[PDB]
Amino acid sequence: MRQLLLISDLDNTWVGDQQALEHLQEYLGDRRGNFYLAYATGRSYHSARELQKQVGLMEPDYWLTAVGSEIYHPEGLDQHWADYLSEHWQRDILQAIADGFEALKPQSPLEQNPWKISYHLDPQACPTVIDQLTEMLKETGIPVQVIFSSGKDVDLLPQRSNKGNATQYLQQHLAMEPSQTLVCGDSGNDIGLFETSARGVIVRNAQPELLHWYDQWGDSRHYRAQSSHAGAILEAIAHFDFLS
Ligand SMILES: [Mg+2]
């Protein structure tokens, strides 16, 4: 219903260069009705809101949060995405099984949601505990994925849940064409975004994992910005002739 669907990662992409962030937001603010804006972050909705207060993030149309587990718009959680993630999802039994692992301790309630069961691995425990949990869960027909990061954090999420999938869902939901979509990212975790049928911008400060993906699979739709952080988004908007 608008000219552009702008989907951007937050940390180290939209955020990182405060001056550039302000320049980008002032520009977009004067043409607000011409594009849909979605922040796609690994942060929980609450954490994303805290970052908004921290750096003054402009209000987006959508928030793709918590490893794609929850999509929010100003009036609430998107129910179609929720139903999609709920299909064959069994949070109670998964939580009950994971709770049984002495080496796993539940993360704060702030990090939990209907489609995300999170834990902390005991620093004195062995990662094989995660192998055991993962193998056990694969012995079931439950579409769950186990994500172990930083050698301490454990997320149990629907297999359907991730940033790229949430982005693809949003794109079709809003009926926006690939040529009208622009994804922005910096890390290996943003590769899913770039697998979206859309134009994309890789910020200059991108992590090697994303750069290696770009060098091998990137095509005409993927712009290697000269500028870093938010500056790369302004650069890409001009490059792809958006909002002109
Ligand atoms: Mg990032």
TrEMBL record:
Cofactor: Mg(2+)
Catalytic activity: sucrose 6(F)-phosphate + H2O = sucrose + phosphate
GO BP annotations, alphabetical order: sucrose biosynthetic process
GO molecular function list: magnesium ion binding; sucrose-phosphate phosphatase activity
Biochemical pathway: Glycan biosynthesis; sucrose biosynthesis; sucrose from D-fructose 6-phosphate and UDP-alpha-D-glucose: step 2/2
Root EC class: hydrolase
Binding-site positions, Mg(2+) 2: 9, 186-187, 189-190
Pfam families per UniProt: S6PP
Record domain Sucrose phosphatase-like: where: 3-241
Protein's name in the database: sucrose-phosphate phosphatase
Annotated source species: Synechocystis sp. (strain ATCC 27184 / PCC 6803 / Kazusa)
Lineage summary: Bacteria, Bacillati, Cyanobacteriota, Cyanophyceae, Synechococcales
